[PDB]
Amino acid sequence: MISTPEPLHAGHILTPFCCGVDSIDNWLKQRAMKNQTTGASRTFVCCGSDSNVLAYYSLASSAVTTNMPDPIPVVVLGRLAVDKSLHGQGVARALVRDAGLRVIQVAETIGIRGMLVHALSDEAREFFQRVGFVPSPMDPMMLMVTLGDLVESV
């Protein structure tokens, strides 16, 4: 059975994680623990029976601007992936909900106004649209949920 999303630490077992996208498997195994300690991003993991990561996603703080207006703080949803063992069962949708609830509970600290995600393929765009993200005016492969839509959704 899959544990509650918690911050990645050195006790989590990464090697067997396979979501079917090599680069996203590699990032978890090669870069995630380093990111976690340097504070580049914050990674959250679900575990199975033996501290083995079955799923993960990363959040980072970012800002949107133009051109000199004050940039808008946003949370960027980075990589998100589920072990193939758990595909087609609402786990990824539950990770997006987990991310959305984090964004709500932190939003007023530094004035987060929404959550963005960079779709890395047409497949990912379809998936992100399918759980409630919408294309941004900046880029059709850069999707968003407003803090307003998030808060009203709960």
Partner 1 sequence: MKRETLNLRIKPAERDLIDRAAKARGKNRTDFVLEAARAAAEEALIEQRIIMADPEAYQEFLVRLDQTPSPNAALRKTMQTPAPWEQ
Ligand X SMILES: CC(=O)SCCNC(=O)CCNC(=O)[C@H](O)C(C)(C)COP(=O)(O)OP(=O)(O)OC[C@H]1O[C@@H](n2cnc3c(N)ncnc32)[C@H](O)[C@@H]1OP(=O)(O)O
Left if phi > 0, otherwise alpha if psi is -120 to 50, otherwise beta: which for 20?
left
Site map (CB under 8 A) of partner 1, residues 135-154, x = contact:
-xxxx-xx-xxxxxxxxxxx
38 makes contact, choosing from ligand X, partner 1, a copy of itself, none, with CB < 5 to 8 Å by partner type, with a copy of itself
The CB-of-4 to partner 1 minimum distance in angstroms stands at 5
**Dmax over Cα atoms in the chain, in whole Å?**
51
Distance CA 143, CA 85 (A): 27
The reply on whether position 91 binds partner 1 by CB under 8 A is: yes
Alpha-carbon dihedral 137, 142, 146, 150, rounded to 10 degrees: 150
Chain contacts with ligand X (rule: CB under 6 A)? 19-21, 24, 78-82, 87-93, 117-120, 123-124, 126-127, 130-131
Contacts 24+ apart (CB under 8 A), 118-127: 118/76, 118/142, 119/143, 127/92
Q: Which partner, partner 1, a copy of itself, ligand X, none, binds residue 36 by CB below 5 to 8 Å per kind?
A: none
Per DSSP, 27 falls in state: H
Size of the site for partner 1 (CB under 8 A): 84
Given a copy of itself, ligand X, partner 1, none, residue 37, with its beta carbon under 5 to 8 Å by kind, binds a copy of itself
Which residues here bind a copy of itself, judged by CB under 8 A?
Answer: 34, 37-38
